[PDB]
Ligand binder design. Sequence first.
Ligand SMILES: [Zn+2]
Length: 258
Amino acid sequence: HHWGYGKHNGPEHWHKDFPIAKGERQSPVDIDTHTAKYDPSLKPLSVSYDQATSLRILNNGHAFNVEFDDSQDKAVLKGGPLDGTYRLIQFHFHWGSLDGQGSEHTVDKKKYAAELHLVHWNTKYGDFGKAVQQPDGLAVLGIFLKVGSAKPGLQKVVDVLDSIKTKGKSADFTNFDPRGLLPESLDYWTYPGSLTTPPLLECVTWIVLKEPISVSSEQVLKFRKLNFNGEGEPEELMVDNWRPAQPLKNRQIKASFK
Ligand SMILES: [Zn+2]
């Protein structure tokens, strides 16, 4: 037995192995745009991805992860609600079985077809494993995906998924530029939260972009051909790998824009 997204091991079960699932600053949440508070003391995001060095793409049994070299300040996030410098370590997606679901965050109860998470860790803690133990240890940039026109910058990712169909498989994935995954605007909401997968640690500063990117029906369809299972095991399609919205509790969502 292990946690997953099935009927018998899904989000509603996670609290048994990971009690923090019922904690005070769990993610994702519903962003209520009318009760979000505009904060003019919030700065612009500074995204510096021009020296980013992608290494590998991996099917870890619940998503696929594109990994980056985080040994130096190559791809960093600064500004916004953050204090200090956050290094990009990986990005991954959450998606659905149908176009009308897939995102983790929702906006006035609207679900998007998928959600992209660019995960960064605060360099003052020296390594990722130390960072996740701290309340200001990670920053995650969340980007919604809607189905419309194709996203050209996503296609290199889509074309390599056949080679990592099953859990545990990995492929070399160098020279991918994550700047091709960003929307035009960097307007955002931000709130303190958690990882949305076990161990669900409450160490994340969420930065959710307002503007979705559009991908084609064909591109998201390829996501849905991946497998939760390992090679030689019964085929389980990797779909609906999203956690539903959690209670906001004593938190406020702030907006960088009016
Ligand atoms: Zn995620």
